[PDB]
Design an enzyme around this catalytic site. Structure first.
Site, PDB file in Angstrom:
ATOM      1  N   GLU A 114      40.294  28.372  -5.559  1.00 31.15           N
ATOM      2  CA  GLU A 114      41.513  28.928  -5.490  1.00 31.15           C
ATOM      3  C   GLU A 114      41.583  29.922  -6.729  1.00 31.15           C
ATOM      4  OE1 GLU A 114      44.310  26.310  -2.817  1.00 31.15           O
ATOM      5  OE2 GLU A 114      44.106  25.838  -5.030  1.00 31.15           O
ATOM      6  N   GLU A 126      53.223  33.157 -34.744  1.00 34.34           N
ATOM      7  CA  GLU A 126      52.792  34.263 -34.041  1.00 34.34           C
ATOM      8  C   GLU A 126      53.948  34.816 -33.081  1.00 34.34           C
ATOM      9  OE1 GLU A 126      49.797  33.897 -35.888  1.00 34.34           O
ATOM     10  OE2 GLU A 126      49.818  35.408 -33.972  1.00 34.34           O
ATOM     11  N   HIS A 145      50.068  29.702 -25.306  1.00 35.47           N
ATOM     12  CA  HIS A 145      48.987  29.308 -25.968  1.00 35.47           C
ATOM     13  C   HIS A 145      48.400  27.842 -26.334  1.00 35.47           C
ATOM     14  CE1 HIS A 145      45.381  29.509 -28.665  1.00 35.47           C
ATOM     15  NE2 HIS A 145      46.197  29.259 -29.673  1.00 35.47           N
ATOM     16  N   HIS A 155      38.206  28.734 -29.950  1.00 33.75           N
ATOM     17  CA  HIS A 155      39.720  28.660 -30.210  1.00 33.75           C
ATOM     18  C   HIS A 155      40.582  28.123 -29.237  1.00 33.75           C
ATOM     19  CE1 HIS A 155      43.517  30.384 -32.528  1.00 33.75           C
ATOM     20  NE2 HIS A 155      43.854  29.048 -31.969  1.00 33.75           N
ATOM     21  N   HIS A 178      45.155  25.027 -26.593  1.00 35.06           N
ATOM     22  CA  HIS A 178      43.634  24.752 -26.807  1.00 35.06           C
ATOM     23  C   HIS A 178      42.983  23.921 -25.669  1.00 35.06           C
ATOM     24  CE1 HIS A 178      44.497  25.133 -31.496  1.00 35.06           C
ATOM     25  NE2 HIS A 178      44.948  26.240 -30.851  1.00 35.06           N
TER      26      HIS A 178
HETATM   27 ZN    ZN Z   1      45.588  27.820 -31.515  1.00 34.70          ZN
HETATM   28 ZN    ZN Z   2      43.066  22.765  -1.857  1.00 32.81          ZN
END
Ligand code: ZN
Ligand code: ZN
Ligand code: ZN
Ligand code: ZN
Ligand code: ZN
Ligand code: ZN
Ligand code: ZN
Lengths: 274, 274, 274, 274, 274, 274, 274
Positions: free
Chosen positions: G171, G117, G141, G212, G143
């Site tokens: 947050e 990629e 990237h 994914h 999972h």
């Molecule tokens: Zn992947």
């Molecule tokens: Zn905190």
């Protein structure tokens, strides 16, 4: 049942070898120790034995030791390491039905085998057994420092050496009245040196291997270690005396004789006769 | 996950330094020890390694040691204290890709560095690796008392010294058949002495530094300590003998030769010739 | 806050006195040890201090030691027992703002007092503080066996003795390049021996008391113990050499000079022009 | 001599507590561990023992445990810290001649004492010793997360709970065929709960304390940790299953029975009956 | 030569089992791993083999594996302990000239023997060898937590289970396009369960044992571990989804088909057809 | 003097923040930790301090914290990195004689500053100092996962929540008998949330910030971490229980009272009268 | 010149991929990481670069990246192995004079290539460079488990998903105020997914790939990992909540608005008007 490593004999072996190592008598793999046990001693620990005990033939038939179990130190093993890994450094072996060889029932893990002075030990055990009517059960070999040093300045003579050692400490004549046998130097780990040692064991509980070490026999671990320690102590005293110029005075023969009479023991005549 | 302080090599280092200390061979910070490890030995302990290892340029590049890890004793460190604080006195270093320097992955805390004699060790490690085809992994230096004392009374000659040590204990010829190399006195810590020691390591597993100490090599901590301890034991026996007036009898050449054949080993010819 | 017994200084005191006992340098109540601490060292142990600190006037005021704390061994106490009961055998004292005396903040139980030699120690601490610009913090006295033996056979001269000890082990010149001061025999426990020792401390880190013992100074417990151990080790080697007939060879005068040069240290000149 | 901190049992304790910590079964100081040793295990370390062991009267006398040594976790101690300072968090105690109390021979520094649940442990040790004829040597308590969670949704019944755990992982019936004992909730630290737990130990190697934790017994640290880990693993699987709506299929009784025969083990009848 | 414990395959075995243990897939002795090696891999380490390799007959003739060496995990051994004692927990075995049994060439020390799911492993190896033309070399079994949990709520149907797992993570169809085989629950450690598994191995690289674990095959250690880890990851995602109420959306069949087309792989038709 | 990085407090800070990161409670820069030290703690590290300590004015003066030193985590710093570079992520600050501000004596390199929440921490330290008579020395905030999850499903009421957590693990009532304070959601970093938290600290050692995290106080790092870990563990158990359908049984109101009685602690009354 | 393996960026890459593996976000070879460096970064290591860099024509020129060097993860590489062999799993590439292709300057040994990629990453890097005025330098990237699970139960709509994640941890709105982009499921590795992702990157720093994984962008390795970790933490909390039956209470729309205003950030408007 209880683990065999916690048995009296395994613990005894650990103690003797460890004390010997601390005494400075067993550098590297120097020295060896074998103890004659009874079937009853090890019977309780059958579940600890190797499922397929290794069998090793014996150098020469020893019928008198048939079906006799021993706990022994391994060949090339360090006395120093016995305490923390008993199974690796010690082994329990049992001479077969006709004294042709033995099975390693316990220990000597990792393709290890009994000490290389084993044919020597068994031969001396047999002689001490007859000589003491089955009372002696231990054979111990170590490199007693001072005893070794003395084999380079004293005439390698049984009577002569025995007499000096008796003189080196008052109780020596009482501890080993039969004296100390001195063999000529011989190549070690041999059936030969084993034969000669066994022959001396017929006459003495202590045998010296010039420029090498000492061989001792006794009823128990402590008594045997104690026997060797006494001779080495006398030797240590002698080394200091000689180093200072020699004896100005010492125990007289009459005195050594009186000592023998008092403790009802009969001193080696040849040594006594000097 | 177990702490690296409990690994076999850290424990082994603790044991060796502690034992040498108890022997009296390592007063103050005299002596040093380096052990060659395999990446597989330290791989389990990645979590104990310093995040950003301190790099230390190696004087002479040693490509033969590239990517090789070692556990070493520190500079200015006491053998006596190793058991008390392993991380403070020991360090794991790894030689970089081209053997130009090393990174300190663990230990040697508070900005401590490896033994100043490290380069000398590396040189010898290299010669022993070639000489034993990678079997030897340990280089140990200590101030063996009697061995030192003997360098003041015996001819600083390899053949002569080796012969006396072989004579001092039956086992010596079998333990170190290659004999003992004796260098002339040299300023320690120099590239010169490291070079000469490595030179001797090509022929012997044991090297003496007159009026200073001993240098030993072997496959494991125990075998190397054992090697040195054996030589020192013989030396101790010799010191007592000489102190008593000298040898009256000893092991003969022919006997030393028989011993050599019995154990399948070839004795340093020059030493036998005597 | 952990107990003070676990503090680095109490533990160090135990370690040093115990090691010395195991060495054979401190039979009965022979020897003493004092360590100069910083207030920050004992500050965290306010809870362990004695509610009503006892006060003891110093015969001779030590103004330069005002408000200075020390951990010391007790009078009549056995080095061997320090480990069995630190508080009973050790004590932490703090000299007051005007060096007139000190308060026993911790230890010295059952009304025990510091070594009767505390005043002599204080005198030397002062001289060493000046001589090393406040780095030396320890004064140690023990009966180093071989060092004592040598005072009966070697000329009791600072230059001659120093030369021999330097020769007895390669490292000695580097460890104590200022040499060893040798006082004539004197009655122990007198302000005279204390004064004379202090005078020698101005020039040497090591002082010998013929037929008695050694006196050492250094920055830490290990360094001082290490200093003494190094000299005693050389002495030990010398005793063996002399016992064997004397040196056949040794470190040359030029070699000692080279050694000094290499380690960037300047050796006592007198010791090299005998 | 190696420090007791490097013994197999100290390392084993470190390993077990460290692993349980990483598992998340021992937040804060929850949980405790006691291991029965043999005098032979601690005999090598006499030099590490406290000079004058602190004695601690035992509530209920336990003659069965007389002269028996144990290594235990301390009261108020964190499992997470065991690896960091073994001596501070662990202690070796030895029950006196009549099991009326014990002496703390090593560890438990800064006046720390054994786990407050110690008496409960001793009770169970006694019942397991009888029940397994001295094979079991470990009693471990921890807060196994999923096992705890299940005590809030499953019927607190031995047969039911055991059946679900057997079902949660094929191996469970073989690992703990005797099933799991479930006590009703009880105030912890009481003689009451120790008594009831010991009661259950007569029938099971695993006992659950609803809304609190698990109690396990076994021959070694690994086997006991392994026993608990297996039950906790099954419990974890069950938690996920229940969370998904419950079992659609599972291991059948007949299957559980076949499993029992295949591995030569007899399943708690009541649990099978279900 | 280099020690065998430092070989790529031994290190690989340590890594796989250790990672599996940390994943929480191998409590106690749960799981097993076998790796098919080549003669050339172990030929270099002949000197490490046991001098008298133990021979163990094989459950059923496996000619196809004649003279084939494997490194395997021992029966009843903990994945957790592999890392620090490889030889005790791992063993290298070699099927004889006619696949009747094998010799334990290395490891499995102390009467240990290969895993109890061995007849299962060999049978699956044979099938994967033909099914992948000798490319698959690893057979791994572990108790993948979520995969196990799913076997209690999903219909134990290959097509059904395969489809859900494909849906659980986009790359699953690409990693295991042949799907996952699901056997009915069966008593473990049997020739029977081994047969059935091997049969499924003909069609799949992944086989599930309901309420027990997973069985995976692959070309290397990493690829195999990776295969299992991928399925377990999908299963873990599925467990959370189901626990939240089930899928609101998911990967469509058209999409799964497109995915298959893109990565040039053909998805199990039955599973794809749902 | 060892480097300050090796001090018990710097090491403790590393341990706590690292353990918290490994727990999953401190993603990114979430959380903070401040520990109140004594001057005697940092006194020995004068050498490690910054020559020109930076000064930072305190918005609101803390007179009761005058001349009080703290070790704190930095602003924007990742708990995960604390171990990779202590000085960069931690800082030792000392409030001046009038509590107007503080000097950064150590750490906080590259111009980093203390947590922007230092002022809120100081406010709570004050309230806790008063509430515990100077025993509490730590304020810790982290994002305890399960505790956070529960704030979305349980009534955000101090009594109701406290009751559930007590029920989630037997020890909870004993560890935090004063209960857990629950504030309504508030914008973090405001003097308002700091003021409200401080108010709750007057009554509780634990305070929850809905949909955000937990706030804990205690005497030492371990106790505070332990406190939080205990509550999070109970929460973890509760999450599983609720996920399974809710409690079928639990610790009764009377049992909780008995528990309180036994451990001599008085439980928050409101939590037992719901 | 230092070795590149210890460079900040190589070590950073190791730390990020390793942490992600420990998180369970990168099973097998799932996920990838690319970091944009400045020539000033790699310049010092020119000496470690491949003598003849391998060139790789890029799908489509990217002038914005001309002459830009990146450190990237390799194709088919396991995040778990990066720490074991950086050079084998990572590679430093430099985009040529006109974004036509790149040279593999370092790493990616044994003929490895950047992640399949790399072009999709490059595409997003460009969009993020423009979007953040050259501040963003990382594309990651992985999972993320819970984020993935949520894509099966939440409406895959940017506004709806973003609101839930903001709600899952206080947050989150402050960390990713621009929200999270959700693409429809798409075949991985196609030009379309890379395009679509890049388009979302113009508006969001976080993009989800249903069933994914996640795609994140940020200025540094820690900030980016931190960004993803924050979202995954919120998701993790949400999974627990939903599993318990859903939110009883949560952060209000108004409160989210106040939070935004307080930290001077403008929250995605769509997410706040559902
Ligand atoms: Zn992947
Ligand atoms: Zn905190
Ligand atoms: Zn011998
Ligand atoms: Zn030296
Ligand atoms: Zn004296
Ligand atoms: Zn408990
Ligand atoms: Zn299994």
């Amino acid at each position: 049942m209880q683990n065999i490593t916690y048995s009296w004999f395994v613990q005894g072996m650990i103690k003797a070898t460890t004390d010997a190592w601390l005494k400075g008598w067993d550098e590297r793999n120097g020295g060896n120790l074998t103890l004659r046990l009874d079937d009853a001693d090890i019977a309780p620990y059958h579940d600890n034995f190797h499922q397929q005990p290794r069998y090793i033939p014996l150098s020469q038939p020893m019928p008198l030791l048939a079906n006799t179990p021993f706990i022994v130190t391994g060949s090339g093993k360090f006395f120093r390491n016995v305490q923390l890994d008993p199974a690796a450094n010690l082994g329990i072996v049992k001479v077969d039905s006709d004294g042709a060889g033995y099975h390693i029932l316990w220990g000597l893990t990792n393709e290890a085998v009994p000490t290389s002075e084993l044919p020597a030990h068994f031969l001396s055990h047999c002689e001490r057994i007859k000589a003491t009517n089955g009372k002696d059960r231990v054979i111990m070999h170590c490199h007693a420092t001072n005893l070794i040093a003395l084999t380079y300045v004293l005439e390698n003579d049984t009577a002569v050496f025995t007499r000096q050692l008796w003189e080196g400490s008052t109780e020596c004549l009482v501890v080993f009245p039969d004296g100390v046998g001195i063999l000529p130097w011989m190549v070690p780990g041999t059936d030969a040196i084993g034969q000669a040692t066994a022959q001396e064991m017929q006459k003495h509980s202590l045998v010296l291997w010039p420029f090498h070490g000492v061989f001792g026999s006794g009823p128990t671990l402590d008594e045997t270690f104690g026997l060797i320690d006494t001779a080495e102590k006398s030797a240590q005293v002698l080394v200091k005396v000689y180093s200072m110029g020699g004896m100005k005075q010492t125990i007289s023969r009459e005195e050594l004789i009186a000592l023998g009479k008092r403790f009802g023991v009969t001193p080696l005549a040849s040594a006594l006769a000097l």
